Amino acid sequence: GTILIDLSPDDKEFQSVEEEMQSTVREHRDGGHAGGIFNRYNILKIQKVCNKKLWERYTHRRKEVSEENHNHANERMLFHGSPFVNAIIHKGFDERHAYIGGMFGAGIYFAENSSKSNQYVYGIGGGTGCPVHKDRSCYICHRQLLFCRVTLGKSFLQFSAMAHSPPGHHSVTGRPSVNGLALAEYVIYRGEQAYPEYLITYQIMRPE
Ligand SMILES: CC(=O)c1ccc(-c2nc3ccccc3c(=O)[nH]2)cc1
Ligand SMILES: [Zn+2]
**Cα(139) to centroid of ligand 2, in Å?**
7
Residues 6+ apart with CB under 8 A from 167: none
What distance in Å separates the CA atoms of residue 135 and residue 35, rounded to the nearest whole number?
10
**Cα(97) to centroid of ligand 1, in Å?**
8
Which residue has the least CA distance to atom 1 on ligand 1?
A: 123
Decide if 83 contacts 127 (C-beta within 8 A).
yes
What distance in Å separates the CA atoms of residue 188 and residue 169, rounded to the nearest whole number?
10
User: Which residues fall in the annotated binding site for Zn(2+)?
Assistant: 130, 133, 138, 141
**Cα(10) to centroid of ligand 1, in Å?**
31
Which ligand 1 atom sits closest to the C-alpha of 110?
14
What distance in Å separates the CA atoms of residue 188 and residue 176, rounded to the nearest whole number?
17
Task: Indicate the helix (H) or strand (E) that contains 195.
Answer: strand 194-204
Which ligand 1 atom sits closest to the C-alpha of 123?
1
What distance in Å separates the CA atoms of residue 114 and residue 95, rounded to the nearest whole number?
22
At 169, the amino acid letter reads H
What distance in Å separates the CA atoms of residue 58 and residue 182, rounded to the nearest whole number?
28
* Residue 9: count of CB within 10 angstroms of its CB: 11
User: Which residues fall in the annotated binding site?
Assistant: 130, 133, 138, 141
Decide if 155 contacts 139 (C-beta within 8 A).
no
| Overall resolution, Å | 2.5
Write the CA distances from 110 to 6, 11, 132, 177, 189, integer angstroms. 23, 26, 26, 17, 11
Write the CA distances from 87 to 37, 101, 102, 152, integer angstroms. 27, 20, 21, 22
Assigned CATH for 1-208: 3.90.228.10
Decide if 199 contacts 62 (C-beta within 8 A).
no
Show contacts of 54-63: CB within 8 Å, 24+ apart. Answer: 54/1, 54/2, 54/92, 54/195, 55/195, 57/92, 57/192, 58/149, 58/151, 58/192, 58/193, 58/194, 58/195, 60/192, 61/151, 61/190, 61/192, 61/193, 62/151, 62/193
Which residue has the least CA distance to atom 20 on ligand 1?
A: 99
**Which of 88, 93, 99 is the pocket-test mutation for ligand 1 (most atoms within 8 Å of CB)?**
99
What does the domain layout of the chain look like in residue ranges?
Answer: 1-208
At 128, the amino acid letter reads T
Write the CA distances from 46 to 56, 155, 167, integer angstroms. 22, 29, 37
Task: Indicate the helix (H) or strand (E) that contains 185.
Answer: strand 185-188
**Cα(168) to centroid of ligand 1, in Å?**
24
Instruction: Give the DSSP letter string of 26-86.
Output: ---TTTTTTT-S-SSEEEEEEEEEE-HHHHHHHHHHHHHHHHTTTT---EEEEEE--TTHH
Decide if 5 contacts 25 (C-beta within 8 A).
no
In this structure, the residues whose C-beta lies within 6 A of any atom of ligand 1 are 79-83, 99, 109-111, 116-117, 120, 123-124, 185
Cα–Cα nearest to 192, from 3, 20, 4, 51:
51
What distance in Å separates the CA atoms of residue 208 and residue 204, rounded to the nearest whole number?
12
At 73, the amino acid letter reads A
Angle at 120 between CA 196 and CA 159, to 5 degrees: 90
